Amino acid sequence: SVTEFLKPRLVDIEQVSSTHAKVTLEPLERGFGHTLGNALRRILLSSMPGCAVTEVEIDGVLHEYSTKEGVQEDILEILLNLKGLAVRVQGKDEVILTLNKSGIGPVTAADITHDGDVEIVKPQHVICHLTDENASISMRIKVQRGRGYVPASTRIGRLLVDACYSPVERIAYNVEAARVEQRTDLDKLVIEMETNGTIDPEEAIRRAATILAEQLEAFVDL
Amino acid sequence: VTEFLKPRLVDIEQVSSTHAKVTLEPLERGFGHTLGNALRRILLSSMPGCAVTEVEIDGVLHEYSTKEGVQEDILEILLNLKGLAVRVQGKDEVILTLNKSGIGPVTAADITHDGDVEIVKPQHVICHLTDENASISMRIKVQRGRGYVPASTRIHSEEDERPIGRLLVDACYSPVERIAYNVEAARVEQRTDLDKLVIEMETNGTIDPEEAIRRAATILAEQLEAFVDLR
Amino acid sequence: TPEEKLLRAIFGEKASDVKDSSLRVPNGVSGTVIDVQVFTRDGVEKDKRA
Amino acid sequence: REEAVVWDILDEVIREHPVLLNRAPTLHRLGIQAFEPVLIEGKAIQLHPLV
Amino acid sequence: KPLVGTGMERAVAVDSGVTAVAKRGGVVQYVDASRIVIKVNEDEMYPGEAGIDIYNLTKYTRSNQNTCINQMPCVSLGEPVERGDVLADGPSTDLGELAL
Amino acid sequence: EIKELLKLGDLPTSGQIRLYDGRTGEQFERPVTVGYMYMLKLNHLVDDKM
Amino acid sequence: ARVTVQDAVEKIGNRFDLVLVAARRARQMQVGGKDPLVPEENDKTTVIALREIEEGLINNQILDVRERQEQQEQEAAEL
Amino acid sequence: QDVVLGLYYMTRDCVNAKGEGMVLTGPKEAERLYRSGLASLHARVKVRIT
RNA sequence: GCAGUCUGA
DNA sequence: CGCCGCGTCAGACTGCA
DNA sequence: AGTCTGACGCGGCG
Numbered sequence: 001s002v003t004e005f006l007k008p009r010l011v012d013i014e015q016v017s018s019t020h021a022k023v024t025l026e027p028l029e030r031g032f033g034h035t036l037g038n039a040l041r042r043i044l045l046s047s048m049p050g051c052a053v054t055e056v057e058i059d060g061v062l063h064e065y066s067t068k069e070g071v072q073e074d075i076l077e078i079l080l081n082l083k084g085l086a087v088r089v090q091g092k093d094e095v096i097l098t099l100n101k102s103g104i105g106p107v108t109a110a111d112i113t114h115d116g117d118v119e120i121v122k123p124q125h126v127i128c129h130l131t132d133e134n135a136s137i138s139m140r141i142k143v144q145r146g147r148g149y150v151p152a153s154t155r156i157g158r159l160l161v162d163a164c165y166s167p168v169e170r171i172a173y174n175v176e177a178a179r180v181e182q183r184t185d186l187d188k189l190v191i192e193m194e195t196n197g198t199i200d201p202e203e204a205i206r207r208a209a210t211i212l213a214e215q216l217e218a219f220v221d222l
Numbered sequence: 223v224t225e226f227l228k229p230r231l232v233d234i235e236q237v238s239s240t241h242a243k244v245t246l247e248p249l250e251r252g253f254g255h256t257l258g259n260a261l262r263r264i265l266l267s268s269m270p271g272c273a274v275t276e277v278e279i280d281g282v283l284h285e286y287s288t289k290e291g292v293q294e295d296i297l298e299i300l301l302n303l304k305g306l307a308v309r310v311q312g313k314d315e316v317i318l319t320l321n322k323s324g325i326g327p328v329t330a331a332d333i334t335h336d337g338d339v340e341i342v343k344p345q346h347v348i349c350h351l352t353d354e355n356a357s358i359s360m361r362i363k364v365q366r367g368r369g370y371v372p373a374s375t376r377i378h379s380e381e382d383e384r385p386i387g388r389l390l391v392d393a394c395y396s397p398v399e400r401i402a403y404n405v406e407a408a409r410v411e412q413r414t415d416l417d418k419l420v421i422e423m424e425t426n427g428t429i430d431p432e433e434a435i436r437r438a439a440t441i442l443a444e445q446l447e448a449f450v451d452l453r
Numbered sequence: 454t455p456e457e458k459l460l461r462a463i464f465g466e467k468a469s470d471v472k473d474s475s476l477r478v479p480n481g482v483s484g485t486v487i488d489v490q491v492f493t494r495d496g497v498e499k500d501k502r503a
Numbered sequence: 504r505e506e507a508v509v510w511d512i513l514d515e516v517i518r519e520h521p522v523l524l525n526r527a528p529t530l531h532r533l534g535i536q537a538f539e540p541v542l543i544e545g546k547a548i549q550l551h552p553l554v
Numbered sequence: 555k556p557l558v559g560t561g562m563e564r565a566v567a568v569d570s571g572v573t574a575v576a577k578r579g580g581v582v583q584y585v586d587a588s589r590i591v592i593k594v595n596e597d598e599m600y601p602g603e604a605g606i607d608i609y610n611l612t613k614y615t616r617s618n619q620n621t622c623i624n625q626m627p628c629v630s631l632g633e634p635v636e637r638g639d640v641l642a643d644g645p646s647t648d649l650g651e652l653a654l
Numbered sequence: 655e656i657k658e659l660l661k662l663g664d665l666p667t668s669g670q671i672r673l674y675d676g677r678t679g680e681q682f683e684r685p686v687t688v689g690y691m692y693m694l695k696l697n698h699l700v701d702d703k704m
Numbered sequence: 705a706r707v708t709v710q711d712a713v714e715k716i717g718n719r720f721d722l723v724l725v726a727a728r729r730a731r732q733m734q735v736g737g738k739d740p741l742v743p744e745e746n747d748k749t750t751v752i753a754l755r756e757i758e759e760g761l762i763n764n765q766i767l768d769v770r771e772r773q774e775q776q777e778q779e780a781a782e783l
Numbered sequence: 784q785d786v787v788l789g790l791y792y793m794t795r796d797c798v799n800a801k802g803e804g805m806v807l808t809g810p811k812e813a814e815r816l817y818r819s820g821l822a823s824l825h826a827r828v829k830v831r832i833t
Numbered sequence: 834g835c836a837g838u839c840u841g842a
Numbered sequence: 843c844g845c846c847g848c849g850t851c852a853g854a855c856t857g858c859a
Numbered sequence: 860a861g862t863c864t865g866a867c868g869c870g871g872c873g
Contacts, residue, residue, distance in 0.1 A: 002270035002314075002366055002367055002368045002395075005268070005444070007448055011448065011453065025448060028445070029268065031263060031267050035445075038256075038259065038260075038677065038678050039256050039259075039260045039442075040449065041818070042255070042256045045815060045819050046252045046819050047226075047250065047253065047256075049223055076806055077831075080806055080807075080808055080831055083808055093223060147224075148819075149815060149816070151805060153802070153804075153805060164812070164815075169811050169812070169815065170811045170814060170815065181507065184543070184544045194811070202452050205449055205452060206449065206450060209452075210450055211226065212442075212446055213443050213450055214226070214228065215226065215229065215249075215250075215253055216439045216442055216443045218230050219435055219436045219438075219439035219440070220439055220443045221436055221437075255679055255680070258679065259679025263677075284486075285485070286487045286614045286622075288586070291586060292586070292587060293586060293627060295587050295624075295626065298626075350630070352585050352586060352630075481701065481704075518748060519705075519748040519751045525851090526842085526851085527849095527850045527851035527852080528842095528850040528851070529850075529851090545700075546703075546704040552785075552786075556692045557690050557692065558690075618855080619697060619854080619855090654694055683824070696841095697840095698840095698853095702853070703841095703852090
């Protein structure tokens with residue numbers, strides 16, 4: 001027939017980690033490797049929903065460069081540690097977490113004041129280091145639900161953070177040559193995916209394909 | 223936030239018989255180019271269409287020949303028949319017949335009329351007869367397919383025998399010749415982040431622009447099932 | 454040879470007197486025969502196609 | 504006849520079997536190098552860009 | 555043809571013998587993939603002459619390099635031709651100009 | 655004269671247009687020289703070489 | 705699968721010795737009735753031999769010891 | 784001659800490139816920012832590298 | 834098998 | 843003054859005993 | 860052996 005297309009027969013998932021996988025689909029029609037790979041890549045990168053830190057207000061800091069005593073990082077690095085804070089919120093679109101910690105040593109994410117609906121995916125995520133044994137850091141962290149990546153340069157004494165809403169942190173793919181019964185023009189799509197922990201990789205691939213296939217539902221022939 | 227606006231096939235503008243502009247609207251920010259390039263690749267590579275795959279001229283034994291009274295070689299007649307833009311309803315194969323005599327051009331309007339076979343460009347010159355006693359008579363087997371299948375690969379179908387005199391034509395089945403697209407900012411009742419995709423198709427006339435978008439989106443949405451389940 | 458002497462006596466036919474020296478298309482080339490020119494020596498019987 | 508099982512045989516026959524590739528003039532030692540064959544469908548030997 | 559050429563194409567094509575150039579002006583009386591019959595003008599035919607030039611075109615013969623040399627009629631029926639006008643393009647000539 | 659002829663045909667006189675990747679659908683970062691070159695096919699066919 | 709023998713070369717400290725040891729073991733596997741010491745992973749006997757070399761399982765000394773032992777035990781099977 | 788030009792183009796920097804000055808959590812965020820189109824391949828940036 | 838010619842890298 | 847050397851691989855076509 | 864010859868290189872080396 002002229003409407004029957006090769007559909008992926010071999011789907012090999014290799015979980016290199018809890019948050020990193022390689023999904024090999026084979027075989028695709030010639031040139032479908034790049035179609036599916038690039039559509040999924042674009043959706044995983046810039047259109048996938050999720051929730052991440054957008055703003056933070058530290059008690060004694062007025063702008064991104066004013067340093068704070070007792071902490072071994074400049075504020076430019078506390079914000080860089082907060083940007084990578086993988087967080088889930090179930091029932092809201094905006095939460096204001098609070099991190100109060102004084103004394104000596106690392107301030108991990110486990111020291112954030114608990115709210116029942118906000119999970120922290122990696123409670124061993126270090127945010128700053130207190131050094132003086134009377135150093136106290138008290139900050140308010142605005143977790144906000146969105147989609148994609150929204151740099152702080154666009155959203156312009158609160159401090160802005162680039163809001164990496166998307167759970168995906170690296171999506172790559174390459175299309176190598178598969179073969180079926182002496183046809184070598186077929187394709188084989190190797191997707192290499194790493195999420196931040198809020199979503200296992202194959203679940204992110206599934207949610208991206210669901211997003212695309214739900215966009216297309218106004219044209220499909222059932 | 224988790225909700226996405228879904229594009230509808232808002233407008234189709236048939237600029238010409240072979241050229242059209244289909245508008246998908248509204249699209250969320252970012253899905254403009256995603257759908258644009260996905261549909262562009264799917265259309266431009268996997269559309270089904272009819273093409274001439276076999277010619278049988280009565281006095282001719284091979285392509286590297288001439289018919290007395292026909293201005294073209296048989297090879298140029300075959301290269302002209304390769305571009306016959308035809309659409310067939312309800313068949314995957316049909317054997318058209320051409321009979322013409324007398325001085326003048328032999329065009330696709332001179333093909334014997336079948337009801338379920340629509341020749342979309344009757345002015346397509348197939349050959350020229352330059353003698354009042356010359357006459358050409360051929361059988362033209364058009365076939366439905368997908369993509370480009372050259373004749374040197376279709377010699378693989380070694381059924382009982384192919385006669386001597388059955389000239390094989392390379393088959394380029396896809397009807398789409400050009401696909402452009404543009405993502406322009408068009409708005410809804412009250413929103414500014416919505417985009418509008420305008421897919422600008424140029425076909426040989428043997429496919430309907432809406433049907434091509436529906437077929438492309440169906441190919442895509444049935445190829446995404448292996449990703450939606452991911453077993 | 455002896456083993457082949459037993460073989461063609463088993464399946465019941467020995468080889469003919471003539472050898473296959475026919476013209477064949479070279480490997481890889483595949484075309485259409487567009488012309489055949491037959492030249493026979495003067496005094497040789499012309500076959501039917503000549 | 505090149506039956507379809509011959510190609511499945513061949514994909515095993517050249518599995519770990521290196522072939523030498525040589526381009527004349529072999530001005531120096533690296534003019535002959537052994538690679539593993541990836542069966543391609545063309546008629547042109549494909550040669551890694553770095554060599 | 556070349557979209558960008560140097561103008562020496564019409565000389566290279568005509569001066570070799572691949573093309574069939576008209577020996578006398580006239581009107582194409584008949585044209586077939588293997589033949590062109592030109593009816594010579596009234597002021598060009600010698601006295602005591604039929605006045606008709608027949609150019610039999612070479613079709614699909616073997617080159618020295620086993621390529622194909624093939625002459626296609628360039629002129630069409632009833633068309634008037636001048637002396638020295640290309641009547642039949644050779645191999646690698648497009649409408650009279652060399653096209654490789 | 656080349657640029658005047660380009661400007662006659664509504665093309666950019668710099669000779670380079672912006673192009674998009676066919677596979678990923680996105681624009682090449684720099685303008686790319688596009689134009690019509692007269693290409694030849696030499697008699698060094700790989701059928702004769704293999 | 706084998707793409708570089710650099711690991712198998714430190715075990716047998718010469719490259720022209722790796723070839724001979726690996727070829728002796730690969731012939732033991734290919735025409736002898738011998739079985740690999742590593743899991744045969746759809747490899748050739750040359751690559752299986754190198755994968756045995758690189759895991760310390762085979763060198764010329766081990767091959768000679770094993771051949772000596774099998775020679776003596778087959779000489780023992782004489783009644 | 785093509786890899787050196789690719790890596791030369793990648794590694795260079797421009798002074799007002801898109802996404803200059805921002806602070807990145809690592810190379811993965813840089814690749815995400817590039818493919819998303821939110822930063823230039825030459826944006827002089829501060830990336831935490833291990 | 835050889836000689837001549839041409840060509841390619 | 844006579845003798846010894848003067849890159850490699852390859853494809854094609856003739857004519858020759 | 861008569862050529863209605865060819866020669867028409869070069870650079871070391873012994």
